[PDB]
Enzyme design. Structure first.
Site, PDB file in Angstrom:
ATOM      1  N   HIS A  20     -24.223  10.039  32.193  1.00  0.00           N
ATOM      2  CA  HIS A  20     -23.560  10.597  33.373  1.00  0.00           C
ATOM      3  C   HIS A  20     -22.078  10.243  33.462  1.00  0.00           C
ATOM      4  O   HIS A  20     -21.294  11.034  33.933  1.00  0.00           O
ATOM      5  CB  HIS A  20     -24.294  10.216  34.689  1.00  0.00           C
ATOM      6  CG  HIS A  20     -25.525  11.013  34.905  1.00  0.00           C
ATOM      7  ND1 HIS A  20     -26.116  11.212  36.143  1.00  0.00           N
ATOM      8  CD2 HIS A  20     -26.273  11.716  34.021  1.00  0.00           C
ATOM      9  CE1 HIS A  20     -27.171  11.990  36.003  1.00  0.00           C
ATOM     10  NE2 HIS A  20     -27.243  12.355  34.741  1.00  0.00           N
TER      11      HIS A  20
ATOM     12  N   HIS B  45     -34.160  12.355  26.381  1.00  0.00           N
ATOM     13  CA  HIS B  45     -35.499  12.368  27.025  1.00  0.00           C
ATOM     14  C   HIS B  45     -36.623  11.832  26.064  1.00  0.00           C
ATOM     15  O   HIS B  45     -37.803  11.962  26.351  1.00  0.00           O
ATOM     16  CB  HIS B  45     -35.759  13.745  27.690  1.00  0.00           C
ATOM     17  CG  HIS B  45     -34.790  14.036  28.812  1.00  0.00           C
ATOM     18  ND1 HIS B  45     -34.708  15.238  29.427  1.00  0.00           N
ATOM     19  CD2 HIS B  45     -33.811  13.273  29.375  1.00  0.00           C
ATOM     20  CE1 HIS B  45     -33.786  15.198  30.369  1.00  0.00           C
ATOM     21  NE2 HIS B  45     -33.207  14.000  30.378  1.00  0.00           N
TER      22      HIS B  45
HETATM   23  C1  HEM Z   1     -30.186  19.752  30.492  1.00  0.00           C
HETATM   24  C2  HEM Z   1     -29.687  18.533  30.554  1.00  0.00           C
HETATM   25  C3  HEM Z   1     -30.332  17.477  31.339  1.00  0.00           C
HETATM   26  C4  HEM Z   1     -31.034  17.518  32.473  1.00  0.00           C
HETATM   27  C5  HEM Z   1     -31.210  18.682  33.379  1.00  0.00           C
HETATM   28  C6  HEM Z   1     -31.500  16.184  32.755  1.00  0.00           C
HETATM   29  C7  HEM Z   1     -32.228  15.871  33.936  1.00  0.00           C
HETATM   30  C8  HEM Z   1     -32.709  14.583  34.149  1.00  0.00           C
HETATM   31  C9  HEM Z   1     -33.360  14.173  35.338  1.00  0.00           C
HETATM   32  C10 HEM Z   1     -33.542  15.064  36.539  1.00  0.00           C
HETATM   33  C11 HEM Z   1     -33.670  12.918  35.167  1.00  0.00           C
HETATM   34  C12 HEM Z   1     -34.420  12.080  36.117  1.00  0.00           C
HETATM   35  C13 HEM Z   1     -33.559  11.310  37.054  1.00  0.00           C
HETATM   36  C14 HEM Z   1     -34.489  10.341  37.860  1.00  0.00           C
HETATM   37  O1  HEM Z   1     -35.230  10.863  38.711  1.00  0.00           O
HETATM   38  O2  HEM Z   1     -34.414   9.079  37.624  1.00  0.00           O
HETATM   39  C15 HEM Z   1     -33.245  12.503  33.859  1.00  0.00           C
HETATM   40  C16 HEM Z   1     -33.463  11.262  33.258  1.00  0.00           C
HETATM   41  C17 HEM Z   1     -32.912  10.864  32.109  1.00  0.00           C
HETATM   42  N1  HEM Z   1     -32.162  11.565  31.283  1.00  0.00           N
HETATM   43 FE1  HEM Z   1     -31.694  13.421  31.505  1.00  0.00          FE
HETATM   44  N2  HEM Z   1     -31.196  15.411  31.742  1.00  0.00           N
HETATM   45  C18 HEM Z   1     -30.405  16.065  30.884  1.00  0.00           C
HETATM   46  C19 HEM Z   1     -29.784  15.636  29.770  1.00  0.00           C
HETATM   47  C20 HEM Z   1     -29.748  14.345  29.314  1.00  0.00           C
HETATM   48  C21 HEM Z   1     -28.998  13.862  28.195  1.00  0.00           C
HETATM   49  C22 HEM Z   1     -27.908  14.590  27.426  1.00  0.00           C
HETATM   50  C23 HEM Z   1     -29.277  12.509  28.093  1.00  0.00           C
HETATM   51  C24 HEM Z   1     -28.800  11.456  27.127  1.00  0.00           C
HETATM   52  C25 HEM Z   1     -28.382  11.696  25.917  1.00  0.00           C
HETATM   53  C26 HEM Z   1     -30.290  12.182  29.100  1.00  0.00           C
HETATM   54  C27 HEM Z   1     -30.962  10.983  29.234  1.00  0.00           C
HETATM   55  C28 HEM Z   1     -31.809  10.723  30.295  1.00  0.00           C
HETATM   56  C29 HEM Z   1     -32.550   9.520  30.393  1.00  0.00           C
HETATM   57  C30 HEM Z   1     -32.490   8.352  29.425  1.00  0.00           C
HETATM   58  C31 HEM Z   1     -33.197   9.526  31.550  1.00  0.00           C
HETATM   59  C32 HEM Z   1     -34.192   8.481  32.067  1.00  0.00           C
HETATM   60  C33 HEM Z   1     -33.705   7.565  33.174  1.00  0.00           C
HETATM   61  C34 HEM Z   1     -34.514   6.342  33.467  1.00  0.00           C
HETATM   62  O3  HEM Z   1     -35.326   5.962  32.584  1.00  0.00           O
HETATM   63  O4  HEM Z   1     -34.348   5.726  34.565  1.00  0.00           O
HETATM   64  N3  HEM Z   1     -30.607  13.327  29.751  1.00  0.00           N
HETATM   65  N4  HEM Z   1     -32.723  13.556  33.207  1.00  0.00           N
END
Ligand code: HEM
Ligand code: HEM
Ligand SMILES: NNC(=O)c1ccncc1
Ligand SMILES: NNC(=O)c1ccncc1
Ligand SMILES: [Cl-]
Ligand SMILES: [Cl-]
Ligand code: NA
Ligand code: NA
EC number: 1.11.1.21
Lengths: 713, 713
Positions: free
Chosen positions: A77, A244
């Site tokens: 982010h 993810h």
């Molecule tokens: C289409 C693009 C993306 C969408 C719409 C998206 C959406 C989300 C959402 C809604 C969450 C959950 C937030 C929560 O409720 O804690 C999340 C978690 C996460 N996303 Fe994404 N994401 C995207 C791309 C990315 C990218 C590019 C990365 C890293 C390279 C990433 C890594 C993560 C990780 C690691 C979490 C887990 C957080 C945790 O474990 O607390 N995401 N994502």
């Protein structure tokens, strides 16, 4: 408390040129971040961060006992606000810790992530910035969980106040499209320079476009927003699937439980927000996005399970406990572990936007290839994560520390190392004389060097005259650069360069990038002499010439100026007033209001306008460096009106005779209208100001010539 | 473009502390206005201004062939925004040329007056500021028309951006009282710190209160607003009568003819506004206020015809051509000349607010005495006009050039000349050692010196430690100053001073004002030593001791701090949050956000709180100069809650044990809440910061000690 912004909401706001003064900065004027970082024991910092990963705090317990996922999302982010259109956003200033980004809905609970880093920040102090720490912490999270990164550069200096960035005009967080301030028009066209689908999101809506859970349609938004953050299809799929592979989302209960964002919370919350009345408010009860998805069977370890699940099951639409749309694998066993309860397991789940990687036809082929060849996935993700997190750091000379990757990447707009002696002051005088003897005019030399240097933007530190990319596609063909005249000037400079270089002993040569700048300096010297002033313009050699193959043509398109008030250039008719575009450009060039004033006033009289336009050329001694612009602009003997043919061009007539004296654009006249700008123009238009105008012009010219010169920093 | 101010309209705005950076300033960082002014040929400037008075320009023809009246009103309005409550407004920064004042309704057509002065500004350039020139121009107007001014001081340095001033909460220009943002409550009580009856007026409504044409009632607004601009009855009558001896008002036709104020006008207007579609739009057709009054038979010459008319006729309520209430003399001959037509004459007219000078019983006695004795009138007006136009210039040491009056006025808070050798550095070390040996504690010495120095406000440059007025009425009795403890400290300091001064040869002595500051320096050096740091706090002698007879007690009341976040002091319960009051005080002290942060954090741990309060004293080594404030404030091991007894006091408890560790106010905890402040606190709370905190504390302490030291500038 009623302000100027309340009374006159469409007046120009010059404060944006005066942020980041020494007044708001707690470090001395002498503090050099690079030098503090060069002494940091980076290894010790990484050890502490590794320990932090599994040191769960009760006020925000770690999912699965490991904060890795949270910190990867934090770092993603920090980087993910970046827009290629203006280079604004990105991780390079640590802006996540300030308003508004600290309180964006998509940044919910990243306040907790940053608070977890406080002890480490406090321990190492000024030797590691928050901006560097956030990215390093992401890197360490990946490493902790078994993923080997491509590398890391320090050198992102902290900033001390919010940047002024246009994030949209909506007045409601997360507003759906088509409202009174819609960022979308036409066939789902997102307005430049925005790179997110809703106010307060990073890129797209995880439930689908405007909340509609269609993965195919979601793929369109993904592709458009990611392209607007400099990522192609391969990089995009690698990043989303790679991210993810780790962690989970949080939506254990209704979102109505979640209270004020940080900037709205009470003073007792001590900079934290989104306090939740749902159960314990944290951990197994956490609510962040409202979705409740865990992607893999090992959320705290690198795996190939994302694509195994994505392709291995068929998916059914369902709802989180907070009511959000999300997907569950049809007929699956409970194979996904629970973040807190070792006796519970769960079925595979996915967001709409994850399914996009399968159901968009172009993404599908890349996701298949990554599925079948996991080593390609790993490498693409590593490369994309490095790009994402360093995209706004500027030239390679700014990269600090022992983990900088040695591989040079196309996206870095690389510049070859200089491997020969550089020209000295005698050589510079000889070259400038040859330039002046060749027949090139002041106007040509000034226009060419302005064109080369003024592509620089401090937002992401791309562009500038280093590289001589003005001789390459696409810069050589941009309309604002006057292709035909540019070609003529470059062919003359190149013949001068060939002759000087062929006369040298001992390997000395001059680059064309240096000579373009040097030639512009000679033009300014000549112009000063035309006005009877004896001026030498400073010049620093060391620029090199990049090749066409070192210059990604598509990536270069976003640097095309569609508005350059300094050359009185507008490519078409925009809904943003030109004087706003001028301030925007001044900000990208790192100019204060006084610098912008003096610079524009000089360029007008030197003949830098595109197409030889007379607009704002308020002098009878064109190509002489005088303060004529200001003296004539402020002359109350002239009356101004917008023309019959165009509301954006103005005629200035003798008040007594009605005779036409001049014409001007809004960019020209704004200096005579806006009360702060006019105060500036007055200084330079006073009878005691001729020398000061010439001197301040020289200083600002030289500054613009050196914007990208991080090799000298 | 949606901003942080739109999302979080009640967050603190720190930008107000970071105006007037070198970034916004077009002059070199070396520019010294005083030195440029001292070489100005002021006589030649006044000759040009004198010629300008009767050189009419056709774009804004001179009434009666003489711009005098216009320029007097211009200068009166430049000065007339001043408020005693915070010292903001006034002529001393030339703020009339910037938003919002440039566009206030009461400043209508003063844009034309300023434009008239451009040729002279341009001729003399940086040697005369706009701020000085406005005032000088009014002086020359008066002189050219036969009135002897009391004198003139230059030295008002120009400013380059709008000041952030609270001018009221109304969202509509000239809103009548009693609206949703009414500045009035109770029995017509005007809220502090306002000094005008309606948004966008200078003092009062020329038609009468909220447009009601009752001169008796109008007199009450006049008296209240003028007192709030530091003018008593005699000064007030002299100013109004004196001003309205000259010139005329302008209301030749309906106000609906008049277009946009300057900040709203189109770019082509080139900084002018109020363009009028009525007939020629100017001159004989001019519309400014909407009133149409010419007070005297010789509007371009000093006379005592204002009072002759005021008392010599009886008055009838009437309307201007624009519909405004005004008064005409019953049964008079047409004796008043026309501004443009030598064959047309008019009856005597008056505003409601002019008649106030006759029909208010206290004004009436002054107006009678001035009537019967016009030499007393002239002298009172001269004195009042000097006061008005200089009230915010600060100490006499800032007054420049050859027309500074030699007479010292009580309102100037004068400071006697120093006539003896000053203490040297060895003397200062002996005094500091004697101070520390006397048994005064760190806390007492710091509190006392802070109390003395921190009355300074940069808005009007009043207050500071020079003068030792802290020993005199009323400062010695202000509750913030802890009168009984203050008396004890001062008695000990005075015995030290008597003994040092009695031991000297050669007439060397030390003032108590110097010693109070020097003693505070000793307190800070001792505090630094208590923490194991050896520093010398810089000290500049040369303050002197003013007498009670040289101290206007009533004028001194407005310097009383009712809120001093630096001492954790609030006198009562205000509508404004205390953290807002803290920023307000920081701004008056000329502190940046970093200076305010470091300074507050140090003062807490040195024991500067009023009443020995523990609030914000986050240290176990009180009276030692450390960065404990920040380290303990930022410790996430502590949890904060607002108390049962008070929502404005907070308890900090160990998160694990519930044990009470500290208490704090909003002023304390804002540094851990506000995202820009907490970023500052972090710097000073980091493990590498102890030395930097001591260095930066000492520099800001010294800065506050020196705020009023214009004798050394
Ligand atoms: C289409 C693009 C993306 C969408 C719409 C998206 C959406 C989300 C959402 C809604 C969450 C959950 C937030 C929560 O409720 O804690 C999340 C978690 C996460 N996303 Fe994404 N994401 C995207 C791309 C990315 C990218 C590019 C990365 C890293 C390279 C990433 C890594 C993560 C990780 C690691 C979490 C887990 C957080 C945790 O474990 O607390 N995401 N994502
Ligand atoms: C209760 C206080 C006052 C009120 C309500 C007031 C009101 C006004 C009004 C409404 C105008 C007409 C503006 C126009 O239509 O052009 C005016 C003009 C004038 N006022 Fe005042 N005034 C006050 C105090 C003063 C003071 C303190 C001075 C200076 C010592 C001053 C000097 C003048 C002069 C010289 C003009 C003439 C402008 C010209 O000739 O163009 N007034 N006043
Ligand atoms: N919002 N940020 C910019 O416009 C910028 C940042 C750093 N240097 C120049 C411009
Ligand atoms: N609005 N103006 C002030 O608060 C101020 C002006 C100049 N120095 C200090 C404070
Ligand atoms: Cl930014
Ligand atoms: Cl002010
Ligand atoms: Na950026
Ligand atoms: Na002031």
């Amino acid at each position: 408390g009623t302000s100027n912004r309340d009374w006159w909401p469409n007046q120009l706001d010059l404060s944006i040129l005066h942020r980041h003064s020494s007044l708001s900065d707690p470090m001395g004027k002498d503090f050099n971040y690079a030098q503090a970082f060069e002494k940091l024991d980076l290894a010790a910092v990484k050890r502490d961060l590794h320990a932090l990963m599994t040191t769960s705090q009760d006020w925000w317990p770690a999912d699965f006992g490991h904060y890795g996922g949270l910190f990867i999302r934090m770092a993603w982010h920090s980087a993910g606000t970046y827009r290629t259109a203006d280079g604004r956003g990105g991780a390079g200033e640590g802006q996540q810790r300030f308003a508004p980004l600290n309180s964006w809905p998509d940044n919910a609970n990243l306040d907790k992530a940053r608070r977890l880093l406080w002890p480490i920040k406090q321990k190492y102090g000024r030797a590691i910035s928050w901006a560097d720490l956030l990215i390093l912490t992401g890197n360490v999270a990946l490493e902790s969980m078994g993923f080997k990164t491509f590398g890391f550069a320090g050198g992102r200096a902290d900033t001390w106040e919010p940047e002024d960035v246009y994030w949209g005009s909506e007045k409601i967080w997360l507003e759906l499209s088509g409202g009174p301030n819609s960022r979308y028009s036409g066939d789902r066209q997102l307005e430049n320079p925005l790179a997110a689908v809703q106010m307060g999101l990073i890129y797209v809506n995880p439930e689908g476009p405007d909340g509609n859970p269609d993965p195919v349609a979601a793929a369109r938004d993904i592709r458009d927003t990611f392209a607007r953050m400099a990522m192609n299809d391969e990089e995009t799929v690698a990043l989303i699937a790679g991210g993810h592979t780790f962690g989970k989302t949080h939506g254990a209960g209704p979102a109505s439980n979640v209270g004020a964002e940080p900037e709205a919370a009470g003073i007792e919350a001590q900079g934290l927000g989104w306090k939740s009345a749902y159960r314990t408010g944290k951990g197994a009860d956490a609510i962040t996005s409202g979705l409740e998805v865990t992607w893999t069977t090992t959320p705290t370890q690198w795996s190939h399970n994302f694509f195994e699940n994505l392709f291995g099951y068929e998916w059914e639409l369902t709802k989180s406990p907070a009511g959000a749309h999300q997907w569950v694998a049809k007929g699956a066993d409970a194979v996904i572990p629970d973040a807190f309860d070792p006796s519970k397991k769960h079925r595979p789940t996915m967001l709409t936007t994850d399914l996009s990687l399968r159901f968009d036809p172009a993404y599908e082929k890349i996701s298949r290839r990554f599925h079948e060849n996991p080593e390609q996935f790993a490498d693409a993700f590593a490369r994309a994560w490095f790009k994402l997190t360093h995209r706004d750091m500027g030239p390679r000379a700014r990269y600090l520390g022992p983990e900088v990757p040695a591989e040079v990447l196309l996206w870095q707009d690389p510049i070859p190392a200089v491997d020969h002696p550089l020209i000295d002051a005698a050589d510079a005088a000889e070259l400038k004389a040859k330039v002046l003897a060749s027949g090139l005019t002041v106007s040509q030399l000034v226009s060419t060097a302005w064109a080369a240097a003024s592509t620089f933007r401090g937002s992401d530190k791309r562009g500038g005259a280093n590289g001589a990319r003005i001789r390459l596609a696409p810069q050589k063909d941009w309309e604002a650069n006057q292709p035909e005249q540019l070609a003529a000037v470059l062919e003359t400079l190149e013949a001068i360069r060939t002759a000087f270089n062929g006369a040298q002993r001992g390997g000395k040569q001059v680059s064309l990038a240096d000579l373009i700048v040097l030639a512009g300096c000679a033009g300014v010297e000549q112009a000063a002499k035309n006005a009877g002033h004896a001026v030498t313009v400073p010049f620093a050699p060391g620029r090199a010439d990049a090749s066409q193959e070192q210059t990604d043509v598509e990536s270069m398109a976003v640097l095309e100026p569609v508005a350059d008030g300094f050359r009185n250039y507008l490519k078409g008719k925009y809904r943003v007033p030109a004087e706003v575009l001028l301030v925007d450009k001044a900000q990208l060039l790192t100019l204060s209001a006084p610098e912008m004033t003096v610079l524009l006033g000089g360029l007008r009289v030197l003949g830098a306008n595109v197409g030889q336009s007379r607009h704002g050329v308020f002098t009878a001694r064109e190509q002489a460096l005088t303060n004529d612009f200001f003296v004539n602009l402020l002359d109350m003997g002239t009356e101004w009106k917008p023309t019959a043919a165009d509301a954006d061009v103005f005629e200035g007539r003798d008040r007594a005779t009605g005779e036409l004296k001049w014409t001007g654009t809004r960019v020209d006249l704004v200096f005579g209208s806006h009360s702060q700008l006019r105060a500036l123009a007055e200084v330079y238009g006073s009878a005691d100001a001729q020398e000061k105008f010439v001197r301040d012009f020289v200083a600002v010219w030289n500054k613009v010539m050196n914007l990208d010169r991080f090799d000298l920093a």
